[PDB]
Ligand binder design. Sequence first.
Ligand SMILES: *Cc1cc2c(cc1C)nc1c(=O)[nH]c(=O)nc-1n2C[C@H](O)[C@H](O)[C@H](O)COP(=O)(O)OP(=O)(O)OC[C@H]1O[C@@H](n2cnc3c(N)ncnc32)[C@H](O)[C@@H]1O
Length: 383
Amino acid sequence: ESYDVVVVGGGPVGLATAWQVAERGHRVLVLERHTFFNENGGTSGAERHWRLQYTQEDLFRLTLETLPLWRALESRCERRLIHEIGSLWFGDTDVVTNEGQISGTAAMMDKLSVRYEWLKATDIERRFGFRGLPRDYEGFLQPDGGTIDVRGTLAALFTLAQAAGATLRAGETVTELVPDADGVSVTTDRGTYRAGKVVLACGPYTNDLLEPLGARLAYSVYEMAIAAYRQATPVTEAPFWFAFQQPTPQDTNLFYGFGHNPWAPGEFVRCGPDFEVDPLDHPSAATGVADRRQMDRLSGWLRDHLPTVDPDPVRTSTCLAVLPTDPERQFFLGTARDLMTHGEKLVVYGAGWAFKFVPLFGRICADLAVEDSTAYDISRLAP
Ligand SMILES: *Cc1cc2c(cc1C)nc1c(=O)[nH]c(=O)nc-1n2C[C@H](O)[C@H](O)[C@H](O)COP(=O)(O)OP(=O)(O)OC[C@H]1O[C@@H](n2cnc3c(N)ncnc32)[C@H](O)[C@@H]1O
C-alpha cells in the first residue's frame, strides 16, 4: 500500500492534518498506536484553553488567523467548540513562564487593538473569588478567551476526516521511517507502506522515530497532574485563570484552572499545576497516576487562594505535556529539512501548548505535506 501522505499519530493534530489532506483530494493514511480518542497521550481530559493573547507577536498573529478556522470547523460539525468564558491572567507581571509574561502581553494587546480589563488584587478577589493574594498581584481579563470542548473537537475531526476519505487505522505502531529521494518508507508492527511525505504528530514519541535518522528535537516531557474539584460557593463569573508567580526552589509555582465546562453536567471545575519539573527520560516511564507532591501543592494553593472550590479533589488524572527545552521557543512545527537529508519529506509537529491551534496546525501540516510550503508565517517555529 502507498499513500500521498502517511500521518503518524491519531491525536488532534494528526486527525486535523488528515482531514485537510483528504479534503484537498489526496490519499492519506493515519496510523495510531492505541485507539483514537485515547487518554494516554497529550490529549487527555475534557477541556483546553482558547486565548487570543500571546507574548510573542508572531503567535498572537496566528491566534487571530486561527479564530476563523475554529468558526469554520464549528459550522462543519454544527457544534460550538469554543465557549467564551474569559481568559484571566494575574500575578507577578514580569515573570516569564511557558504561558508567557503578563506585562509583555498587555503591550501586545494594545498594539493589536485587542480588548481587555486591567485588574488589581482587590478586583481579582472581589469578582472572581480568590483570597490572600499578595497586594501587588495584578492582571487582566480578556473576554474573548475561553474553554475548548476537547472531546467534541476530536469527534468532529475524526468524522470529517473519514467522510473526506482518509484511512484511519488504530492499533498499529510505526517502528521506523526512512526518507529517500523518491518518498518515505514506513514500517509498522503490522506491515510496510510507501508515502510521498510523512507527517509526524506523535507527541512525546517523536524522538523515537527521529533518533535512528540522526536527529533529535530539544523538548522535554512532563507528566502533569490534573484534578477535578466540586464548586462549593455559587459562581459570579468563572473564567479560565492562570496564576503567574516566581518559581520556588522545588517547582515552577504556576497554577491554572477553568470555570465549569458549559457542556458538562454537575458543578465540577478542573485545575492543575503547570510545573516543568521531573521530566521523563521516556514517555514509557509515565505512571498514569497524579503525582502526590504536585497534588499536595495544588490542593494546598487552592485551599488558601480560591475558597470557591472544595480543596479535596473528586478525581485526579495525568496528561503528558511536551514543551521545548529552550524557554525562548514555544513550538516545533515545520519540516525536518535542516535536520537530515531528505528531511523535507518529513513534516513534524512536536512540542508546545497546541490544542488552541489544532485547526491551523492541521492546515499547515497539510500544506507542507502536499505542496512544499504554507502561506502562514511560521519561520520562527522551525525545528
Ligand atoms: C498535558 C497538557 C496539555 C495542554 C494543557 C494542559 C495539560 C496538562 N493545556 C492546554 C491549553 O489550555 N491550551 C492549549 O492550546 N494546549 C494545551 N495543552 C496542549 C495540548 O493538549 C497538546 O498540544 C495537544 O493535545 C497535542 O496533540 P497531538 O496530536 O500533537 O498529540 P497527542 O494527543 O499526544 O497524540 C499523538 C498520538 O500519536 C500516537 N503515537 C505515538 N507514537 C506513535 C507511533 N510510533 N505510531 C503510531 N502512533 C503513535 C499517540 O498513541 C497519540 O495518540
